[PDB]
Amino acid sequence: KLMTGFVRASGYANKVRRVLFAITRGKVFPEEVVKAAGELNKIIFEKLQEMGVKKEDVVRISVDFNIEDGKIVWNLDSLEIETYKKEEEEKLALAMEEVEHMEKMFEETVKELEALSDKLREISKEISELVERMKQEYTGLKLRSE
Amino acid sequence: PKLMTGFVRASGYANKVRRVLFAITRGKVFPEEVVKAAGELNKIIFEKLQEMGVKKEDVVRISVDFNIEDGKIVWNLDSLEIETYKKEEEEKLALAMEEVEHMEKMFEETVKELEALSDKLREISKEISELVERMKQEYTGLKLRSE
Amino acid sequence: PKLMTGFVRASGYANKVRRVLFAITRGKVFPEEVVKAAGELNKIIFEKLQEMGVKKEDVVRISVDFNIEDGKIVWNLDSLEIETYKKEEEEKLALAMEEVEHMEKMFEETVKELEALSDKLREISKEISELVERMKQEYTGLKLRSE
Amino acid sequence: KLMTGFVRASGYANKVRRVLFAITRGKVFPEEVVKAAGELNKIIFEKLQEMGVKKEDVVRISVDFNIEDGKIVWNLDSLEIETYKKEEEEKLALAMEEVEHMEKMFEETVKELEALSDKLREISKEISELVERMKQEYTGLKLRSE
């Protein structure tokens, strides 16, 4: 079962995808997760529209699904969307907006991290290239190209 | 284009040929071709060294013109020259080449140490890249590589 | 300058205080001071939470003004506000905060994985730097760091 | 004993230092090696001058030394400088010049490597900093500053 727990509606789609990545880990290729989540979020968003849900509102989303041949097959029947109007849940709404905000800031950190890892991957590749080149030019060592 | 080993102890002619070949075809040819081309030449050279009564203590100089055609090394076997220098006639040169050969065996231990390090590094770098992407997937709305 | 936790399950107030403190004093203060200042405040807060009959299932909001003087965090205990929200009166808020707390415990496993990786990385990087310098020493006339 | 083996005179000083680094490895601090070699090479160069040795000539240098309290103490008495005039040793001289040349080229490679390792060290430090910062800002994990 996929469960978001409480989430501000504005950020329901990201939360769905995040949970989906975590629970299908190793069981499915990322592209499938992205594809499966995109579909569900399309459906969810239509229902949120029909339900008069604002982005300030808080929702909980649940849905059973199955993995068949490495493919996520949703059971749309099992989809539940609990809604919580901001005006009826002032504090919950406030807390979820706070969560959403903490997350936007954390993403700046992740992007900083990603940039570093990218640089790192590049440098690592260069080092591996240079090293192999030295093997070729300055030694009789067994080569990768052998 | 010409391949030249300069002075080299016969025992290590084949590695030297390959090393020079890698350096001068750099960018112009895929490594596998270099390995393949050198292997062929070294096969021929070794037959000639046998015929010439060359010992591994002797010192040789090898020269050979070749062309790169369609990214392939084509030797001109006609241009191949093998100058030989008998240890007994060139005791100092022979000694020096043996010293070179020895310094090179030691330097290879260093390179292997370096390679191991770079391998570990590559592994760690890949792990970090994997983990980072996973955090993007699980803790953010950031654009994913898989998108 | 004001420290604000926003909504947080009481059970994890102390970590949240420290986290917010690190973020807002960034660059202005040494980490050891942040740890020291937060430890003090959290000591006081916990006494008050005890006196207030706050359970760890309850949700609190903490606010407190402070000043940085000579790179030292000086709390203004007068400005400290502890808003409390009983689980039984705020079942959904309490549930949400417990969910947050849980997502955070899981995220920490990820951070520890990352830390381990970065540690390995630091070690490998140091080794590489050592080896490289050693090659400068042993196989080159290059200017050395020790010069 | 320190022994250079055959070396073109032009590059005797670097060869001395290199051999010294290799044989005192772990037994002595680099600064001492640099200091000790600098001294010997000063003396050697004076003798090379007195001996009418050109830089095209080939020399062999031997010298016993002792390590006392982590300090290299030369035994100048044991110093031997075999010389080989280019004109009397055409082929040896040619070979040593070739060696010297291969070494100049290899140094370009080492400098490339050093630059990479420097970048790597920098990136590694940044990563360690960022990681610790995330511990501080997004977790309750035990900190290094604790």
> What DSSP string runs through D20-50?
HHHHSTTTS-HHHHHHHHHHHHHHHHHHHHH
> What residues of B are in contact with residue C128 (Cβ under 8 Å)?
114, 117-118, 121
- Two structure tokens written together for D104: 């100049």
Residues 6+ apart with CB under 8 A from D116: A123, A126, A127, A130
User: Would you call C128 and B117 a contact, using CB atoms and an 8 Å cutoff?
Assistant: yes
What does the alpha-carbon distance between residue C26 and residue C19 come to, in Å, rounded to a whole number? 11
User: Would you call D136 and C31 a contact, using CB atoms and an 8 Å cutoff?
Assistant: yes
User: Would you call D6 and B96 a contact, using CB atoms and an 8 Å cutoff?
Assistant: yes
Q: State the method.
A: X-ray
Residues 6+ apart with CB under 8 A from B122: A124, A125, A127, A128
What does the alpha-carbon distance between residue B141 and residue B120 come to, in Å, rounded to a whole number? 31
DSSP string of chain B, one letter each residue: -EEEEEEEEGGGHHHHHHHHHHHHSTTTS-HHHHHHHHHHHHHHHHHHHHHTT--TTSEEEEEEEEEEETTEEEE-GGG-EEEEE-TTT-HHHHHHHHHHHHHHHHHHHHHHHHHHHHHHHHHHHHHHHHHHHHHHHHH--PPPTT-
- Two structure tokens written together for A25: 């880990």
> What residues of C are in contact with residue D36 (Cβ under 8 Å)?
none
φ, ψ of residue C7 to 5 degrees: the values are -65, 135
Q: Report CA-CA distances (Å) from C116 to D56, D125, D131.
A: 54, 14, 10
Q: Report CA-CA distances (Å) from C101 to B92, C19, C21, C95.
A: 77, 13, 18, 10
Using a CB–CB cut-off of 8 Å, the residues of A that contact C are 5-6, 84, 89, 91-92, 94-96, 98-99, 120, 127
One-letter amino acid for residue A52 of the chain: G
- Two structure tokens written together for B124: 């760690």
H helices present in chain A, as ranges: 12-23, 30-50, 90-138
Please, which residues bridge with residue B85 across strands? Answer: B59
User: Would you call D109 and A130 a contact, using CB atoms and an 8 Å cutoff?
Assistant: yes
What does the alpha-carbon distance between residue C125 and residue C103 come to, in Å, rounded to a whole number? 33
Residues 6+ apart with CB under 8 A from D102: none
- Give the residue among B62, D138, B107, D128 at the shortest CA–CA distance from A120: D128
Tell me the three-class secondary structure of B2-19, residue by residue: EEEEEEEEHHHHHHHHHH
Are the C-beta atoms of residues A124 and B121 closer than 8 Å to each other?
yes
Resolution for the entry shown, Å? 2.4
Polymer length of chain D: 146
Are the C-beta atoms of residues B73 and B17 closer than 8 Å to each other?
no
Q: In what order do the strands lie in the sheet with A58-63?
A: A2-8, A58-63, A80-84
For residue C79, what is the DSSP state?
G
Residues 6+ apart with CB under 8 A from B114: A131, A134, C128, C131, C135
Hey, of A85, A91, A114, A117, which one would you mutate to test binding to chain C, going by the most C CBs within 10 A of its CB?
Answer: A91
Largest distance between two CA atoms of chain C: 77
> What residues of D are in contact with residue C106 (Cβ under 8 Å)?
none
The dihedral built from the CA positions of residue A7, A9, A14 and A20, taken in this order, carries a sign that is positive
One-letter amino acid for residue B75 of the chain: W
* Closest CA in chain A for residue D131: A113
Residues 6+ apart with CB under 8 A from C128: A127, B114, B117, B118, B121, D117, D120, D121
- Measured in angstroms, the CA of A81 and the nearest CA of chain D are apart by 29
For residue C53, what is the DSSP state?
T
Please, which residues bridge with residue B68 across strands? Answer: B73
What does the alpha-carbon distance between residue B5 and residue B15 come to, in Å, rounded to a whole number? 10
Using a CB–CB cut-off of 8 Å, the residues of A that contact D are 106, 109, 112-113, 116-117, 119-120, 123-124, 126-127, 130, 133-134, 137-138
Q: Using only C-alpha atoms, what is the Rg of chain D?
A: 23
What does the alpha-carbon distance between residue C11 and residue C136 come to, in Å, rounded to a whole number? 56
Cα first-last separation, chain B: 48
- Measured in angstroms, the CA of A131 and the nearest CA of chain B are apart by 6
Hey, of C139, C142, C143, C147, which one would you mutate to test binding to chain D, going by the most D CBs within 10 A of its CB?
Answer: C139
What does the alpha-carbon distance between residue D33 and residue D30 come to, in Å, rounded to a whole number? 5
- Give the residue among A42, A51, A36 at the shortest CA–CA distance from A2: A36
- Give the residue among B3, B2, B9, B6 at the shortest CA–CA distance from B94: B9
Hey, of C113, C115, C133, C140, which one would you mutate to test binding to chain B, going by the most B CBs within 10 A of its CB?
Answer: C113
User: Would you call D120 and A123 a contact, using CB atoms and an 8 Å cutoff?
Assistant: yes
Are the C-beta atoms of residues C71 and C30 closer than 8 Å to each other?
yes
- Measured in angstroms, the CA of C32 and the nearest CA of chain D are apart by 5
User: Would you call A92 and C97 a contact, using CB atoms and an 8 Å cutoff?
Assistant: no
Name the residue facing B137 among A18, A118, A121 (closest C-beta): A18
One-letter amino acid for residue A36 of the chain: A
Please, which residues bridge with residue B110 across strands? Answer: none
User: Would you call A120 and D123 a contact, using CB atoms and an 8 Å cutoff?
Assistant: yes
